[PDB]
Design a protein around this motif. Structure first.
Motif, PDB file in Angstrom:
ATOM      1  N   UNK A   1       0.904  -1.141   0.000  1.00  0.00           N
ATOM      2  CA  UNK A   1       0.000   0.000   0.000  1.00  0.00           C
ATOM      3  C   UNK A   1       0.998   1.260   0.000  1.00  0.00           C
ATOM      4  N   UNK A   2       0.614   2.432  -0.575  1.00  0.00           N
ATOM      5  CA  UNK A   2       1.463   3.608  -0.869  1.00  0.00           C
ATOM      6  C   UNK A   2       0.712   4.722  -0.116  1.00  0.00           C
ATOM      7  N   UNK A   3       1.432   5.582   0.675  1.00  0.00           N
ATOM      8  CA  UNK A   3       0.942   6.762   1.430  1.00  0.00           C
ATOM      9  C   UNK A   3       1.855   7.909   1.170  1.00  0.00           C
ATOM     10  N   UNK A   4       1.399   9.158   1.140  1.00  0.00           N
ATOM     11  CA  UNK A   4       2.279  10.341   0.877  1.00  0.00           C
ATOM     12  C   UNK A   4       2.758  11.064   2.193  1.00  0.00           C
ATOM     13  N   UNK A   5       2.715  10.399   3.325  1.00  0.00           N
ATOM     14  CA  UNK A   5       2.963  11.055   4.559  1.00  0.00           C
ATOM     15  C   UNK A   5       3.897  10.134   5.243  1.00  0.00           C
ATOM     16  N   UNK A   6       4.725  10.795   6.057  1.00  0.00           N
ATOM     17  CA  UNK A   6       5.781  10.187   6.793  1.00  0.00           C
ATOM     18  C   UNK A   6       5.156   9.518   7.977  1.00  0.00           C
ATOM     19  N   UNK A   7       4.646  10.392   8.871  1.00  0.00           N
ATOM     20  CA  UNK A   7       3.721   9.971   9.938  1.00  0.00           C
ATOM     21  C   UNK A   7       2.285   9.916   9.341  1.00  0.00           C
ATOM     22  N   UNK A   8       1.730   8.716   9.114  1.00  0.00           N
ATOM     23  CA  UNK A   8       0.417   8.486   8.475  1.00  0.00           C
ATOM     24  C   UNK A   8      -0.320   7.745   9.623  1.00  0.00           C
ATOM     25  N   UNK A   9      -1.604   8.033   9.792  1.00  0.00           N
ATOM     26  CA  UNK A   9      -2.527   7.496  10.769  1.00  0.00           C
ATOM     27  C   UNK A   9      -2.688   6.022  10.429  1.00  0.00           C
ATOM     28  N   UNK A  10      -2.814   5.120  11.426  1.00  0.00           N
ATOM     29  CA  UNK A  10      -3.234   3.739  11.200  1.00  0.00           C
ATOM     30  C   UNK A  10      -4.559   3.519  10.346  1.00  0.00           C
ATOM     31  N   UNK A  11      -5.523   4.390  10.552  1.00  0.00           N
ATOM     32  CA  UNK A  11      -6.792   4.410   9.822  1.00  0.00           C
ATOM     33  C   UNK A  11      -6.510   4.408   8.374  1.00  0.00           C
ATOM     34  N   UNK A  12      -5.670   5.336   7.910  1.00  0.00           N
ATOM     35  CA  UNK A  12      -5.419   5.424   6.495  1.00  0.00           C
ATOM     36  C   UNK A  12      -4.988   4.168   5.787  1.00  0.00           C
ATOM     37  N   UNK A  13      -4.035   3.427   6.340  1.00  0.00           N
ATOM     38  CA  UNK A  13      -3.476   2.170   5.784  1.00  0.00           C
ATOM     39  C   UNK A  13      -4.272   0.983   6.076  1.00  0.00           C
ATOM     40  N   UNK A  14      -4.972   1.063   7.182  1.00  0.00           N
ATOM     41  CA  UNK A  14      -6.090   0.084   7.405  1.00  0.00           C
ATOM     42  C   UNK A  14      -7.170   0.198   6.264  1.00  0.00           C
ATOM     43  N   UNK A  15      -7.717   1.376   5.966  1.00  0.00           N
ATOM     44  CA  UNK A  15      -8.538   1.548   4.859  1.00  0.00           C
ATOM     45  C   UNK A  15      -7.950   0.980   3.493  1.00  0.00           C
ATOM     46  N   UNK A  16      -6.721   1.399   3.112  1.00  0.00           N
ATOM     47  CA  UNK A  16      -6.026   0.844   1.932  1.00  0.00           C
ATOM     48  C   UNK A  16      -5.781  -0.661   2.009  1.00  0.00           C
ATOM     49  N   UNK A  17      -5.649  -1.193   3.198  1.00  0.00           N
ATOM     50  CA  UNK A  17      -5.300  -2.569   3.276  1.00  0.00           C
ATOM     51  C   UNK A  17      -6.600  -3.268   3.035  1.00  0.00           C
ATOM     52  N   UNK A  18      -7.678  -2.927   3.707  1.00  0.00           N
ATOM     53  CA  UNK A  18      -8.916  -3.664   3.650  1.00  0.00           C
ATOM     54  C   UNK A  18      -9.519  -3.403   2.281  1.00  0.00           C
ATOM     55  N   UNK A  19      -9.251  -2.206   1.741  1.00  0.00           N
ATOM     56  CA  UNK A  19      -9.687  -1.888   0.389  1.00  0.00           C
ATOM     57  C   UNK A  19      -9.202  -2.924  -0.649  1.00  0.00           C
ATOM     58  N   UNK A  20      -7.888  -3.101  -0.764  1.00  0.00           N
ATOM     59  CA  UNK A  20      -7.291  -4.249  -1.469  1.00  0.00           C
ATOM     60  C   UNK A  20      -7.800  -5.654  -1.210  1.00  0.00           C
TER      61      UNK A  20
END
Lengths: 234, 109, 109, 235, 109, 109, 234, 237
Positions: free
Chosen positions: G144-163
């Protein structure tokens, strides 16, 4: 094993049944087969026994096939002078012996004859107490001629009483949401039977009878029975 | 010919219990209770698939029922009321074929 | 099968004449054609007592009918309507006994 | 010489409520014939039965005609004849005692002498029918035979046959008319007329309508005339 | 408000005669009575197009009704029986919109 | 028109995947899908109480559903069968008012 | 660092009887998102309001995000931030209070990270790898790809479950093909925490409540966090 | 030249109506419009008049349009002081007004107007009239209606009579009627007979206004002199 007390979701809900409660009621409203001192005559499947008992009430039958949980159970009673009591059905009762007198079907109900009686004309009384919406509104007594007796014979007596006093099951529906009959063997052993029939529209008779194929006997001088009941609103 | 109704006429009394009997010879599993009305034909009230079984038909309020023998199937008016007057039949039937009897004129006032 | 029904599945168009056959084995007099609506058991559309005869049941509007032969009795919809989409039982008749056949469902798109 | 009907003489169809298909069946392309036949049997005093075999469908291997009286039956029972008439099946019976279900049909008079009765050669007599709706003679037409002496019935049954096709005389469920009758007028000035509509009520008895043909009334094909009188009411 | 049915809950006795009542504020011409059937959703017992029309609906047997006035439309059970125990709902309508009432629990011993 | 459905008449073959749409102008949280069916009141298939959400009706079986906007709610039939042929009512709704659309005939060949 | 769920600490899909779409929706190519914005208004004390308009359709203009409390919103009230959570509408309650009766609104929890200092250079994007387990055997992974250094768990949880939704049927409209699941976050700094993939048991799913867990506004070091997703099948 | 009585063929049967007989009943079961000593206050069309009668029972209306049989018949009472009796409908009842405290309530009928002056009993004594009731060719019963009017509308008397028969003999129930057929003959003394069909037309619908229309004639009888009998028929066993 002592299976635990059911909380609301385990319990079949009368309002969710849309067939004819008269069809549960049939099985209990002074309805039963009973014979004292008999030996079986022949078998169908491996795990059931056939007797010539006939109908004391109507002319419905000359032959009864009680079906048991496995063939060891019917190995054991195969040539025993027994006592049959329990609650019989015909929609879907098919067995094979020609060797037009009639035929009916149940599950379990067997007791070895010799030994299991009371040595004059005496009987045995078993208290049942009754709880509506957690309150003890009514308690009463049941009767039997045997000392190790089936949990089945005593369920039938006790519902026979409540159909007529507390209107447990009427033709249409029933004044009750949930209801379960709990046993309290004197050793902690505590089984139940859910009293309402499964939700939807028909009700399989022979499948509700079948919980009884276990032939689970109990002891009539010691057992305790609890009927737990709920009503819901307007 | 093959599926007798008792009573054959019968007037009853606002608020009584009426019990009509339907008896049959061919030992069929199935049995039914229909009321004929006019420009209504036979509408079905209750049916049944053997000793012990009874099911709702299309018009089934009012009436209870009961199949104690193979041969015998009863319809019952919980509390007779004017509007239950009609001509009532039953049938037995193995599969494809049905077998009626000749009517019961019930008149309630 | 002392009552047969062609076709078993028909799909039709609004405004279209549609005929439905029944052959019966046995040379019986009476024949009946009913439509099965659920809610409605079987309401009766047109029956007949003889080759040539035909008679309106309770719900005949929108339907014709025809006995050419003792065997054949058939039902017809003059100009089919979506409304006439149902399932169709036809019988042959003894006295008290009836023999249905296996039905024929129809759709007027 | 029965005389012309008035409104209360004639059957209103708006008073029939059963199915007119039942009337119609009798006159749309429906008639029994044989040519040159001897009575082979009999049921009751006044009938004659032949072996005539369903023309169109397969409905019948023998026919029972029922004439007026037993010394009408007698009159033909061993004469070589010709048969044509309308046919019914509801409520027709004849226990000849020879079962194997042989189909059987029934019919009234409609029986004519074979020899001499047929026009010599090609040729068929044309018979003229005039049609009055609401008093105006709005169409006429012709209908044809081959017997010089031809039953009133025979020519009744071609006329109503046509005028079903041409005017929907009869339908399945009603008819476009309120009354109708059909007058024959013979050259000897004789007239008779039949009621063309079902009696009032919610049923139609074919057996009996047709009993009108009882008489075996014959009429001279070449000179007889025919009139159909049809009124209406509403739309 | 908009549609107020009376009473909200009510016990009847087998064979008795029960009257439920619907009041409306929207002053319209259509008011409807429905019985709620586990198994077939809301059913129509009777309906009405204005003062002094009742019409029948799908399930009307066991009942009749009256429209006294624009505001009130009420239903009437000619002889309450246990088979008529239900919640019954009244509504009023203009057009594509229905405007319902809170309900009425009827228990019939 | 403030509850609009779509298509207004559709024909389909068994096994295909058919989507009935429905758009509301009112703005109501809540909206609903039923069918019409002989011997059955209007029956509820799926409803919705906001975007995002849908819940099972009483007959939600062999249908999926979808609320992407305030105004949209779609039935979806994923492998159509002959049973799913019927008339379909959208409905948006506000307290006790329902605001029906006009209906979708659907025929599953 | 919380312990790591055992079968009984886990929600089972088969004890859920509602509509699982209602779930698949919070996470099927669905989320809020905004770079470089400053709260415009406030509702309760523990929340902040942002003028973010709907990208996909036209569904909202205000978003309200609710955080653990009043401090944590005072931390960001005035900040120029980025945003990204999974949003809901069914009981989303916040008052405009100048009229604007008329503005489309939606709601979330957490999804806030400051903007200035939290971005890479030139649209460079940092992969987070997720590993997937089915029945206690690793099956696939994926980035999963994010544009932030410190990125919230929510964000990658969303991208992970999205996939896993699109690749494996994580969720369907009616049920799920797996019986339980959780996703675990391991940080470089020793920390672990897991969040239950599957809804409370029953027939209702409360989407507000399920997302409440993203309250605490947790954040990870993208470049170095580890994700696994742990599934069992029926 | 009186009026050719109905052959049974000529009379609505009630087994041929599959709808609701309450819709017929509603009409005659204690339900009338009545006002004494009033005048038309407007009209809708050529041939009707508008009295502000108000409702004295429920509170259902407060002006009545009654619709006469032609422009003349209304040209006539346009302006008379009058009385009014009649049965009245609502469904499909329409008329432009003054519409005071587009509400009040509005009901409609056909016929029922009698001049006021001189049409009254001096006396004190209202006139009674006698109805006689034949179920299947027997006289089963007879009874007596009662009016304040010399010239009294055939309408007024017909409602008083069915109003009776419904309460005594169940003439019109809610589903059907016990009477396969029925009709009501008036026998004027001047020898003249006119009868009315008492059953609804075949169908499942019922037209309250189509049906009431038959009193638009505004027929009058004489209360002292007039003879009524009502002729009913069960079809049963």
């Amino acid at each position: 094993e002592s299976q635990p007390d059911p909380m609301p979701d385990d319990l079949h809900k009368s309002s969710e049944f849309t067939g004819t409660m008269g069809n549960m009621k049939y099985l209990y409203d002074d309805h039963y087969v009973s014979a004292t001192k008999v030996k079986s005559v022949d078998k169908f499947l491996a795990h059931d026994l056939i007797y010539n008992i006939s109908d004391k009430k109507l002319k419905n039958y000359d032959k009864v096939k009680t079906e048991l949980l496995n063939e060891d159970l019917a190995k054991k009673y195969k040539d025993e002078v027994v006592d049959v009591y329990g609650s019989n059905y015909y929609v879907n009762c098919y067995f094979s012996s020609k060797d037009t007198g009639g035929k009916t079907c149940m599950y379990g109900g067997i007791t070895k004859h010799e030994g299991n009686h009371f040595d004059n004309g005496n009987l045995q009384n078993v208290l049942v107490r009754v709880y509506e919406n957690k309150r003890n509104t009514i308690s009463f007594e049941v009767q039997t001629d045997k000392k190790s007796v089936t949990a089945q014979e005593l369920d039938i007596k006790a519902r026979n009483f409540l159909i007529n006093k507390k209107n447990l099951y009427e033709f249409n529906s029933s004044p009750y949401e949930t209801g379960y009959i709990k046993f309290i063997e004197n050793n902690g052993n505590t089984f139940w039977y859910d009293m309402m029939p499964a939700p939807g529209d028909k009700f399989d008779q022979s499948k509700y009878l079948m919980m009884y194929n276990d032939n689970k006997t109990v002891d009539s001088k010691s057992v305790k029975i609890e009927v737990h009941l709920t009503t819901k609103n307007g | 010919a093959a599926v007798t109704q008792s009573p054959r006429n019968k007037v009853a009394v606002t608020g009584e219990k009426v019990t009509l009997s339907c008896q049959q010879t061919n030992n069929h599993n199935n049995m039914y209770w229909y009321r004929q009305d006019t420009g209504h034909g036979l509408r079905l009230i209750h049916y049944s698939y053997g000793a012990g079984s009874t099911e709702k038909g299309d018009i089934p309020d009012g009436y209870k029922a009961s199949r104690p023998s193979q041969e015998q199937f009863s319809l019952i008016l919980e509390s007779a009321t004017p509007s239950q007057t009609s001509v009532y039949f039953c049938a037995s039937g193995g599969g494809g074929t049905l077998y009626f009897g000749a009517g019961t004129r019930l008149s309630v006032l």
